[PDB]
Structures are given as structure tokens and as C-alpha cells.
Amino acid sequence: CFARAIESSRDLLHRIKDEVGAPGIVVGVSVDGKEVWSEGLGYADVENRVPCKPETVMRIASISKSLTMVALAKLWEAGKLDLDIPVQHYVPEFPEKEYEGEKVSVTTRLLISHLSGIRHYEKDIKKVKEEKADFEQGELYLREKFENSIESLRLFKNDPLFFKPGSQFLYSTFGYTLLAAIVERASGCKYLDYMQKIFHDLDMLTTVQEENEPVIYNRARFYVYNKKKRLVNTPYVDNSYKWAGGGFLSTVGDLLKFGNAMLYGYQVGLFKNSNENLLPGYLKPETMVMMWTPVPNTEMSWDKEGKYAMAWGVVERKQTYGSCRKQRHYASHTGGAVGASSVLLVLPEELDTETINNKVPPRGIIVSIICNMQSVGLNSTALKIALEFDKDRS
Amino acid sequence: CFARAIESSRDLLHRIKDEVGAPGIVVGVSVDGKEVWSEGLGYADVENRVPCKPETVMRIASISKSLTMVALAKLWEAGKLDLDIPVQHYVPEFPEKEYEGEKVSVTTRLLISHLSGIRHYEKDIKKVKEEKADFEQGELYLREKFENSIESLRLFKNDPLFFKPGSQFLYSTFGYTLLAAIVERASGCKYLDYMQKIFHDLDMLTTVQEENEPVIYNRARFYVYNKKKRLVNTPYVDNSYKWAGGGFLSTVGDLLKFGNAMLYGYQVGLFKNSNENLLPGYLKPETMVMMWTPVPNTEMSWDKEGKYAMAWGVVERKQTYGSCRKQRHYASHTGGAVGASSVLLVLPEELDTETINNKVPPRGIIVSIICNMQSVGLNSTALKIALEFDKDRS
Amino acid sequence: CFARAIESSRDLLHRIKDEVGAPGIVVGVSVDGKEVWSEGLGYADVENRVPCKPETVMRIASISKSLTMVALAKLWEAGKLDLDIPVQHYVPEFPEKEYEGEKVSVTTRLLISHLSGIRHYEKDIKKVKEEKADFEQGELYLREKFENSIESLRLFKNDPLFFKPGSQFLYSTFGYTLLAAIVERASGCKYLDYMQKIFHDLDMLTTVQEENEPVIYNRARFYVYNKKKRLVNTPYVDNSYKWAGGGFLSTVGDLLKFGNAMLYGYQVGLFKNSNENLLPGYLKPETMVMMWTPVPNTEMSWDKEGKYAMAWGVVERKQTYGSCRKQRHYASHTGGAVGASSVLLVLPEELDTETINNKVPPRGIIVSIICNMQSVGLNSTALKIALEFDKDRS
Amino acid sequence: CFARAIESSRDLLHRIKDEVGAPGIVVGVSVDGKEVWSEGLGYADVENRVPCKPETVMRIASISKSLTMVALAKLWEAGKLDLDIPVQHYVPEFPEKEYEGEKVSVTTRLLISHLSGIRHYEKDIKKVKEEKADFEQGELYLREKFENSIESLRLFKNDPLFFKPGSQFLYSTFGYTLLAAIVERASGCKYLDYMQKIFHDLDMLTTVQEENEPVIYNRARFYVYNKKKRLVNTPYVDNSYKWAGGGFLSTVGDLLKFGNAMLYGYQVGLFKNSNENLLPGYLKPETMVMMWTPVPNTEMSWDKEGKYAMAWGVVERKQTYGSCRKQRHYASHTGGAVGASSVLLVLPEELDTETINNKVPPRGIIVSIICNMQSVGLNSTALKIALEFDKDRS
């Protein structure tokens, strides 16, 4: 039934692969909760000639923020965590900050949406202020091993705030390290154990953390181009200092399952009225709405047409003029890692009365693409693939 | 429902294609805001045997003037631009002109309708005056790259005026280069960025500018016949000096969407009285009327029966004698480029009381035809296709 | 019989294609005068999605020098041309040159082996002398059309000599333009007509010159990577000023046929004694030996282990120490063009008494590889493929 | 002819592989200068399921010392190097050393046989003295990159001598770093370039240095067992500080070729009398004898029955009592690297009058075994395989 869409999507994948020169790429498409397509192109390892397969394990980078958000939402549902309380309640090791000698408060809500003052890789305030008005970074190529989140906090716990909390949007990865410390303090257990339990609940059996010593099957390699336009290996790095921000490894099936679970949790409330036999979602319907609610004064780098919510980028639906562009509602998050690129997209389906009365959730399309090439933007390709699979479905 | 009309239209397309010997041709028909037919005949590329498809990208040439007019109308609605103010207010680099030593004023209104003195490709005043009482041109085969509109102005900013402003009609392309310079000066941003934003608003995702370095998918080739009556390739040209006049690339779907938007903006005022739930048009109803209002002392080359308005050729409706020709109201613009020919036609539907009370805008037919053959007139074929689709609709 | 070798060769081709990120590549292998393998990988045109095929026409660049050498050898056999006579005998438009006020002579023999003083793209003597002790060039991106070789001579006929003739090796392309002028003067006919006749004699029906106006079927596109590591189109260029140097277009089958003809002409003399029914080669046996004879004080850029002969790079066979590297005898020439890379390799087979008495010429392997990627070295891959096909043959 | 021996050797390889639990192992056997057997067992990479093949590239560790010795012998033959001159003549950056205030001289001859005072990984003199009367080391897991040998010298150039030069045998790896510095100073070129030229001369095309950025095909992985008796990956290390001591990567064919070249150079002098058509060896016959001459007061760790020579361990032939053990003459060197084990063995054949008069060199057997397992001794297995292949040969 999806044969026409599959061929075109494969053509689109070839287009992007040849445009960026990626040695390998893997895709995964799920329609209405069922996986209908999964393919790989190229070689996961070019030295040993290992072809790309749906079982390939690659580095999802910032899609990890979404997993941490799921953990935080579950903790908040359990009542252990309060969003508006200052972070010093849970983590007293973080020093209090001043902004030309005025009291400022850093909270979980500000940390989630990046509205907090914490910096990114750059340490020079002047350049950041000039830009507001890179893989060249050193901290991005660290190799030290950090046993715990509290030890990892020492990289940025002494730097001054760059902006007033809640005033300027600045994408950051250390804020989610602080969030992981808060999670492990509030839950009473280690962060990795909590995430492992969550992955077990969601049936994500191939999602593990970036480590070198353990043997991980079907692990791929990551490449980059040098100054002579020749494919080379990326340098060895250790990502233990940022587990929550970008330290996880996964496949396309696990991302499809995660997206399906989120879609079901989002859509179960609408279908609850017609049928009372539906199982409850992993998170409460009000929690799901809050997660996907856009926050004002936020930006979405991979799509200027939408904004940012909680660990997700959300584009809403609207139409301003007749016979003119009709915006479509979807949520997405992209990831950029040394040697790798990924994207996860969710496209909800507009629900009518008859569909609600007859059909059952989830109703939508989830698309996941991962490639072992550095600095590749895959949001547009995923959006096109999702739209075309939306056309075929009847 | 349109099956009878589609077959006849295809026959008409074959007629014109065999008459001119065009290697390929693409058509697009929209009825009442919905695309009902789209087909291609022949080969977009004859060297590699690439068939013509609705996704083919060809060179719309002077249909670009309409896009610039949309930009100018939006700027005028915003209040940034004044039509009657002399152009030296925005562009002081253009020298003031004299006509046997008398002061003359060049304004935006004169530039839009070609009533201005600026010349076309020919530089000899005597021949132009004799004709008033060609692909053989050199400027039509330029290959230099021009970074900005101000740099492009140097090709004609020193030539004397050919006629008194507002006195003689002379179709010109450099006047729209001056218009683009005025647009980029008044809007505060670059012309290409403004047009890109406008195209994004109107959902024209495949409309780009003529460039060689970037990879543009489904780009076609352009051909001409030599002295031995053999098909050959057209010479390489650069169109950077005239973006506004004739430097864009598009498909038939984008032209259909543009025509539908213009038709909705034209017709929403009549339907506003019955229903208040209709979304506003892209431009105000008074702006649309002005755009399609014919201007006296103007000519319409592709149809002697009508006149010229603002970047459009408009034929009105009238009937002088009983049992004799009944003129029909429509608007059209044709384009001639090296190696290419195109046409865009809009046929509004006569509105009665019951149709206004019951139906919703837009009500009409838009037809777009593009072929990769030089010096082909497609206005009559488009008019016949539009009329026949007007017959089938019930 | 060659199934094992074919698979490995395909793997080698994939290796180089992924290493350089070439959108397409075509290979051709001939064993003992019969074509046994021919395949293409990737897309010849990425905008229109045209797959690579053995019929693809790409830009062989400096393999053209070999064709001009064949023309010169045939003229010398006919007795029309003398190698040691100064070039002013045939072309008096070339000015005589002095070297700190001493008489120097430029001859055909010096021009063939690049021992002449004529420069390459660089015009600064100091930098060339420093290097002796680039696609960044301007002359490499010319677009002017030159009707005849004498007109083309004006680009370098006034520059002073860089080194003493016969003293320093300097690879050059304008020397072969002078050679083409000499050919067309001595033969009494135009250079292109002579080469067309030669191609007709050798059954190379798809070998034509680089031109834009004529329709050439199966013509490919040429690409390069920009500063953002994104695939883009190469700029439009005109190669009319260097027909003999790098101005021809060809397939892999034509190169295979050319190599087979050269191999037969080389090897027919050894087999003449046993059988008198063998047809004569295209060139006399003594002429073939001279063509492949290495010249002292010459360099072979694509293989430091060999030297240069007449329009060919020749590596001889030798062994200095026991149980140590055994050199193999072969001839090759590589080509680098804007947007393209190519190689032609000939691997003669060692002949014994029984093989000479029983088998018939040609006995060897010819390999041709062309890719639409700029600055790719394909000599090593061709050598490996030839050696592996040498192993399978029995 | 060797079918009986091959099966038994394979059984022996299985025996050692199961005894040590090595995931993979590769063997290579050459008889009389011709490779007669080559096989691999297990997986080179267990995560991606890549089987072991003869083309696998693994870490030869201290077999590198033999390559440096070949370089030093060639330099000494050229007359550039003097063995008895103090090392301060070539490398003045090395400080002079005192031994309870007495002048001591460090020379190339002492450095070659490890009779020099320089330490190994351990820095505590007391423990070394107690042992004389480990992978637990820190310097063995360094990750810093060192551009040149002079920079690498700083790791041990300030430590005091452990024993009097020429008095006590102490195996060391930094002495060969000093030897590499001496080589690059005396030869006038970089060490890596000299070794690359030597490898090219000996037809060792797959022998490269340990580097991460370049793409090296068929590169294997290296494993170790943890405290829970589970297979894990070895930690990432950089071996740039010891190129000469333990930094090379190779296959079994390259080691076979190297051993064959050494055997030919050793045996050509005996066969020179009968036949004058034999090509000269890579090194002079007197040089080869010196290389394999055992040095008094030296030890051979992998075989207590023999001693040490120049970068080789040599066991001589002798028989003390009648009807009792008859010693056999052979040379060998083993290597231990993080995650890897290797051995190279040469078994010369006893030469009689008729064999010298009739046969041609080389006459012997070379055996190479490499496995991706840490701390495995393979000398006995290689000796047994060589002896059994010695039995089959007739």
C-alpha cells in the first residue's frame, strides 16, 4: 500500500546522501503505530566493508534531551519534583549567581527551555553578546572519564551567567547535565539506572550509553572530511561528562517506539470518550500537552517557522490568508555529534468526529534518520518523507 | 467530470507542439482553486532522454514581472512606498534626464506600465522612432555576474530617454531592474530575500533564481533550431543583471498557486457580504482592483483586443452589437526567454446573486503552459483550454 | 572465468568512490583483445537522476595527448614530418627565443617529451624556479572560442622560455597546442579532420571534441565540492584553445579499442616469425618501440617508480636483489580536468616461446576508469585491477 | 605435497586458540621462498562479525625492532654510521651519564643488544635490582601525540642509568627510540620516510604506522579479559612515542617476504661459488652474519635455550652427548602489544654439497602467527609448525 511512497522516499534519501557525501544512512518509518519501512544505504564501516542495516547502532546526540525530559516528566507526575523551586534545593553544590549585583533564580523550568543564563561551548561573553545582538571547540573533544554528575558539574559551575534567567534564549548542553544531577538527586537513584528502567519500560532494548570497554554489537564508525577533501576517521572522544545532553547510542526502531509512545500519550485523551477499553498512556494527557506547548521568546534552529517547547521543537498549524500556505502541526528534534547526524520527527494526524469514533490511537507518522556524517541537516528530508507517507495512507 | 475537456486540451497541446516542433511541453490546469489536470509531453532533456513531468523546472521569463508587482503592492500597502514620488528619492544613483532641455520626472507608476522613456535592448533611437511611427541582440547573451541591483544599473543609467515619460508605450525590462533597486532600497532588505519570503508565504517552494553553481533538481534544457533546421543547444547565458525582469525558475504548480492567490484576493470582496468567516486575501481588495485596471495608451502584444495594466495584460468584457461577439474578461502574461516559452492565464467567472450567496471564492480557472522552445506564442492555446474547461464545469 | 576478479574489482571501485565522494564512476576491462567487463556506479547527472552506464560520455583530459601522438607518429611514418627540424620550418608565426642571449632550438622531439622551455598555467618564473629547485589558475576557466590553432597560439607565443630546451622537465599543455599547429601545417588539412579520420580508422565512434551547441547523447555532468563540503556544479568553460592537450570526449569502449590497437602494434613483431597470416599493425613495430621508450631526465607524476616516454608514462621491469620486489612492465597516462578524472592503463604479458608459437596477439590487459569528480588519482586502482585480472587469466 | 602438514598445523593452531581464548588468529607459512599456506580462524571484529582473513592488519609490536635493525645495517653498509662512536656524536640532546662518578659511554652497539643502562617501563631502581639479583604500567597507556623522535626523547632522557653499559642485560624499548633518533640524524631524512622506502624496496605494501585518522583497510580490533572473565575492548592508546620499538602494523605476507629476504641474504654467500648468475642480497653476506651472531651475557625470554643477537633471538645448533638432544639452528622474535600477540620465526635448512651445487637459495621455512589477544606466547607453536613442514619437504 505504501509502495509508491517508499520508492520516492528512497530517492530522497539518495539525494541527501550524495549531496553531503555520507558513507552510510539508515531510515525508519512507522505509520499508525506499525513499522512499514526500514532500510539502510552505504557502509557503516568503510575499513572492513560492513553494510548499513536497520540493526546498526549510531550516535543519537541531542535526541537524548527528549529522554531526559521523559524522565523529568515522570518524576514530576510522581510528585517528587517541583519545577519552580530553585535548583539549590536539590543541588547545593551549584553556587548562587548575581547579575550586576542583583538576585537571580535558576529553576528547572528555565533550564528545560534553555532560557537560563548558562553558556554553551564558548566562554567569551563578548562574542556571544555580539552574535546575539562549532566543532572547533576544545571541550567538544574531551577524553577524560567522569564517574558522576556532580564531578561533571565542575566544568561550568564557576562561570558567570551570560544573560538574565528567562530573558534570552541560548541553546546549551550543560543545563541538561545540571538537569541530570537534579534527576539523580530527586529520584534517590543514579541517573543511568533510572534511564535504563525507563528504556526497559518502553521496550528500547538497544539504547545504551557511549562507552568503549563494553562490547556493543553492530556499532558503527564515524567519519569527517579533511582539508584535502578526503574521508578520514573522527578523533576519539569521551562523552561521560554529558550523558543527558548527548551521550546515548540507539537504533531507528527504538526511536520509532519512543515516538509511538509519545504520540499515544498525546492522543489517548481525545479517544477516551468513545472507548473506555483503551490502556492508559505512559504519561498523563495534561503532561503531554505541557511537553509539546511552545514557549514564547524561543527559537527553533532547524526550522525558523516554529518555536521551542520542552526538549522539543514544535511547529503549530495556522493559516493567515485564503489560498495561501497552510501550516501543518508537527514536532521534531535534530542532533549533531562528532561524526554523526540524526533526526526524529512526529507528524500527528488531524482528527475528525468519525475517525475518533471509529479508529484507535496512535494516528500519525514517525520518521527517524541517522547518518555517520558530521554536520548534516536532515529535518527537511524527514518532513518530506512524512508528508508523502501521509498522502498514501487512506 | 473534466474527462471530455482533458482529452480535447491534450489534443490542442499536441497541435501546438507539432506546429512549433517543441521537444517538450508541460501544462497545468486549476478549477475553482483545485488542481484537476497536470501533464507533460516530450523530453525535458533530449541528450539523456529525460521525459517531461509536472515536476520539471523551466525558465519563466517575464511572468517574473508579476512577482515583482506583488512585492511592490505589498510594500505600498505597508505604506513604505509612494508611487508618484520621483525615483531619485529612493535611488539617487540614477541621473536626472532632460528632453530637449525640459524637466521630466520618472516615477514608479510610469515604470510599472512601461510608459517611461527607458529603452529596451536596442540602443539606436532612429530605428525605434521609425518602428513606433530580437534574440539577435548582444545584451541578451551576456555572461557577466552582477552582485547587486546597483551594479546592474550601470548597463542603462547613462542612456538618454527615448520618449517623454507618460507619452509613449515602450515595453522594457531595465525598468523593472530599476523597480527592483527601488524595492530593495525602500524595504530595507535585499530584493532576493524579500522575494524568497513572499514565495514562502504563497507556498511556492520550487521558485528559485537562475544560477549555475547550486544543484537544482529536475532542471530542464533549452533548445533552438539552426540554419540547417536541426535542433541544437542554446548558448550559455547569465541572467543576474535582470532578476526582476526575467531571472526566475518555476514549475506549473507554483504558477497555479500564485494565480489562485491573486484570484482569491480579487474576488473576496464580493463574497465578504454574505459570509464573515472568510479569511482575508493576501492583498487588500482595492489593491487588487488597481493591479488589474487597464491603463490608457497601452498595448497588449499577445492580444490586440486588450490593453496593459500593472505587470499584466487585461482584456475586459463588452458587447457592442446584438448577436455579435461577446468579449470575455480575463488577465494574462506571456514570457519569452532564450530557449523557452511560457504563459499564465486567469479566467474569472461571472458572479450572480445565488452563486455569491452560496459558493465561496475563488471562482475561476488558471492555466499555465511552459515549453523548452524559443519564440513560441501560447496565449491562444491557453485561452482555448480555459474556455473549454469553463464549459465542462457545472 | 573472471567472476572472482570482477567482484574484487567492483569492491576496489567502491573503495575509491567512497574515499573521494564521487557521484559516479565507470570502468572498462579488456582481456586478450576481448572486452570482458564493463560497469557503472552512481549517477552521471544528479539533478535529473541519470544512472551511470558504459555508454556515458565523460571528459578524458590528457589522454588526448596520446591521440595526438598517434597522429604525429602516422605523419612521421608517412615521411611528411621530421622530428629534429626546428618548429619554425612548419610554423613561422612562433618567434625565436633566446636564453641570456644564446641561440636555442625548439624541436618536435623536445615538445613531445615536455623537455621544452614552454610554461604551463603559471606565468611567474620565480615561483616555478623555486618549486623546481592548480585549478586556482585563470587560464583554466576561459570561455572564449578560438577558430584555429594559429589563433590559439597567441596565449603563450610571447612569453619567454622558462628553462633551456632539453635541460629541465616541465609538464605543459601549450606545447601540444603547438604540436597540433605543426600537425595541421604538415598534413595539409585541419587538425580536427585528421583526428576524425584517425578515430574512424580505429573504430572510435563516440570520440568527439568538447562543444556546447551540438547535441551529444549520453553526455554527463561534472561536479566539485565547495568550502561548506557540499556538492556543486563546476563553472562553464570552453576548451577550444587546447584541442590536442585536453579537449576531447570519450567512453570506456573507445579507450579499450585504442589500447588494444596500440598493444597489437607493439606485439605483432614478436609473433610475425611464427605466423605470416597476421594483419599488419596500425603503426610499424619500430615506431611502437620508440613511442614506449622512456626518455632520460623525465618524471612520471602518478608513479615515481617509472619515467616518461612519448605522450605516455612507462614503468619498466627489473629486479635488483633476490627475494625482493619484482618490477612489472606497463604503460599508463592519467588525466585531470575541471570536474573530471580518468586513467588508461596497458599491462603487456610476458611472452615465452610456446606462447609466441601458439597464441596470437594482442596478449595483455587494458583498463579504463573515468569519474565525474575533480582531482582524483586512479592509477593505483587501475594497476590493482589489472594485476588481479592478470591472475585469473589462464 | 604439504597436505598432511597443513592439517596438523591447523590442529595446533586450534589448540593454542582454545587454550588462550583468542577471538581470532592468522597464520602464514612459506617454504623455499614460496608461500604454501595462509589461513585465518575466528573473527577480527566481534562487534560487527568480521571473519579473520590473510589480509587482516594487526599490530606487530616488537618485530619492528628487526625493521629498524635492517635500516641500521643498511646505513652502516653505506658508511654513514659507526657503531663504536658514542651516541652524543649524532644526538647531542642526550645528556652524558655518570655511574658513581665515573665516565661511561653509550654506543649504538650497546643500544642494539640492550646491554645499555637505559630502563624499561619501571622507574624504581630498587625493584629492578631486586629482580635482577607489565601492562599495569602507566607509560604503556599514553595517548599524547609526538611529532618527532627528539620530542619523544624527553620521556627518559633525564633518568639515571640503571646498570653499567655493557655489564647487565635489560630489555628496553626506549633504546630503540634513541636508535630511531640516531637513524634520522645520520641518514639526513625522517625516520618514517626511510622505513617507507625500505618497505617499498622489500615489497611490503601493507606495512604502515599506528595512526587513527587515516583510513586503513582490513584493520582489526584488539581485546582482553576483565576480572569477571568477560571479553572487553582494550583502551585507546597512542604509540607515536615509540615508532621503532613498537609502532608498526602489518600482515603475514609482509612478514613472510621480510623473512625470505633475510634468509636469501644469509644464504647467498654459500651458493655464490657454484653459480655466478644469482642476484645479490639486500645486505652483504658479512652484514647478515653479524646480525645473527649471538652476543655473550644476553638472554632470550621466549626460549631459555638460546641467546640474543642484533634485534633477534638466535638458538644455535649443537649436540653434547651421543643419542641425546640435537639442537637445531633457528632465529625468532616475539611481540607483545596491548590487545595483540605475534611471532616471526626463520628455520634455515642444513646445506650439503649436492644441495649447494644443485639447488638455489633461499632454503628454509618462515612462519608468522598473529592473534588479537593480549599476553599470548606463540614461539613453541611456530617452532612445531616449522619442524613439521620441515619433515614434509623433500
Curated annotation (Swiss-Prot), chains A, B, C, D:
Keyword Lipid metabolism listed:
yes
What tissues is it present in? Expressed predominantly in skeletal muscle.
What protein name does the entry list? Answer: Serine beta-lactamase-like protein LACTB, mitochondrial
Query: Which residues does this entry mark as bearing N6-acetyllysine?
Result: 145, 190
Q: What induces it?
A: Down-regulated in a number of cancer cells.
In alphabetical order, the GO MF annotations are: identical protein binding; peptidase activity
Which keywords does this chain's UniProt record carry? Acetylation, Hydrolase, Lipid metabolism, Mitochondrion, Protease, Transit peptide, Tumor suppressor
Query: What sort of enzyme, by top EC class, is this?
Result: hydrolase
| Family designation | Belongs to the peptidase S12 family.
List localization entries.
Mitochondrion
